[PDB]
Amino acid sequence: MEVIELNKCTSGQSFEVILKPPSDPSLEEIQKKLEAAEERRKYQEAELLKHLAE
């Protein structure tokens, strides 16, 4: 039961107590994933319109 690093100021204080010792995607790749999902949307909507044209 030890109290280390006792720091006291005007608005409080903080310390540490030990009981026992121990034993990304670039900006280019994100635009691609966004534009890729936009393409599958345009392709799905085109197949919807082609269906309506028939």
């Binding site: 909507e45 919807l48 319109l49 309506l52």
Partner: protein
């Protein structure tokens, strides 16, 4: 600002649609001339969802009246609230559809479809942000069926990313105008399977059985059947027309109700349904036990014959929201054998402080149940009874159709039956 564009096509469509605007107009404090005279600000909170604000504080419904014969729409205009509707939003022909899906969809209707969409377009261009459309119509007739589906097919072409809702009256031989209603119904249903996001099924037989048995009406009328649809339409739209912690648009509401693109056919319910012992106060238990009772359901489908994919319940009135949860949670935990176990928390509940006209409190039921397959089984059975002999086909082959298109609608809906079947087991 999330506006809705209403459309009513055909006789049944316009008569039902008219009463609808008569019911909600009274709830929002809109008199037959368009003037507001309510007492609560909640009546105006979401008033721009179904009404366009004109000059002088006048409110003009955002509806489009459509039909191939002038008769029905002349009635609406001379009716109680007929003056409220925009004069231009009346689009009608003179030939009529003769209860022929082909005429409404291919010949007569085709000649008038462009002019109806011109009005649809004019109403959208003013919307700050359109939620989506809603069509009232029947499927056994010729206009609201043949042309109605044709409208949807063309509204989805110009607005492919807007919600398309429909209140569809299904034909029953017990409340039949013509022997060809199963033909018109089978053809429309395939269109709804394709180009609608949500479709409230409303069986005329269930409306008839409710007026006769539950309501004790000796000889029901189409007007009596429409009072139910009026009140029901008002209920399902309560969460949209009034404020609250709900914050839900048509798309978000569909996202939580349609687990599969083609199984978007719901069964609605209303409670109470009392005969004139009408002044008795209705407790929250009674409101719930009836709301789930088949005799209070309008699809003429026994829910205990299938399983619930998702369920939505809206409660109206000043009541104990704590007591609403308990009773709803009680119905689930007492009949959990009829809800699917692969969709957690598929039963939700909403409360609204403003009750309908002349009711301390009420409850509206919205169920996406596989039991609805029994509806399409009746329709398909009545279809095959006639199509196997090619009976009455000439009314359609004369309009430019081929027997092949009938065989496809037949196989299209049988597929819809099989799809609803693999999810009940």
């Amino acid at each position: 600002m999330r506006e809705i564009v209403h459309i009513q096509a055909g006789q049944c469509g316009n008569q039902i649609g008219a009463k609808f605007w008569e019911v909600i107009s009274d709830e929002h404090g809109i008199d037959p001339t368009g003037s507001y005279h309510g007492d609560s600000d909640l009546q105006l909170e979401r008033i721009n969802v179904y009404y366009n604000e004109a000059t002088g504080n006048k409110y003009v419904p955002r509806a489009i009246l459509v039909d191939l014969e002038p008769g029905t729409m002349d009635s609406v205009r001379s009716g109680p609230f007929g003056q409220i509707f925009r004069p231009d939003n009346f689009v009608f022909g003179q030939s009529g559809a003769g209860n022929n899906w082909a005429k409404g969809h291919y010949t007569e209707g085709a000649e008038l479809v462009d002019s109806v969409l011109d009005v649809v377009r004019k109403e959208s261009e003013s919307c700050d942000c359109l939620q989506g459309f809603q069509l009232t119509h029947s499927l056994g007739g010729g206009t609201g069926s043949g042309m109605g589906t044709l409208l949807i097919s063309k509204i989805r072409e110009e607005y492919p990313d807007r919600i398309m809702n429909t209140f569809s009256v299904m034909p029953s031989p017990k409340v039949s105008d013509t022997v060809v209603e199963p033909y018109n119904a089978t053809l429309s249903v395939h269109q709804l399977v394709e180009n609608t996001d949500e479709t409230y099924c409303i069986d005329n037989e269930a409306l008839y059985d409710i007026c006769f048995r539950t309501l004790k009406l000796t000889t029901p009328t189409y007007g009596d059947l429409n009072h139910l649809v009026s009140a029901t339409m008002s209920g399902v739209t309560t969460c949209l027309r009034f404020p609250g912690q709900l914050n839900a648009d048509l798309r978000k509401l569909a996202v939580n109700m349609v687990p599969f693109p083609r199984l978007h056919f719901f069964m609605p319910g209303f409670a109470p349904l009392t005969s004139r012992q009408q002044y008795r106060a209705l407790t929250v238990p009674e409101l719930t036990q009836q709301m789930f009772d088949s005799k209070n359901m309008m699809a003429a489908c026994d829910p205990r014959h299938g399983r619930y994919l998702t369920v939505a319940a809206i409660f109206r009135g000043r009541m104990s929201m704590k007591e609403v949860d308990e009773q709803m949670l009680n119905v689930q935990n007492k009949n959990s054998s009829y809800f699917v176990e692969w969709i957690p928390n598929n039963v939700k509940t909403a409360v609204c402080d403003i009750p309908p006209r002349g009711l301390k409190m009420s409850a509206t039921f919205i169920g996406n149940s596989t039991a609805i397959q029994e509806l399409f089984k009746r329709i398909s059975e009545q279809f095959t009874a006639m199509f196997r002999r090619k009976a009455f086909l000439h009314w359609y082959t004369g309009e430019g159709m081929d027997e092949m298109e009938f065989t496809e609608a037949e196989s299209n809906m049988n597929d819809l039956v099989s799809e609803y079947q693999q999810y009940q087991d």
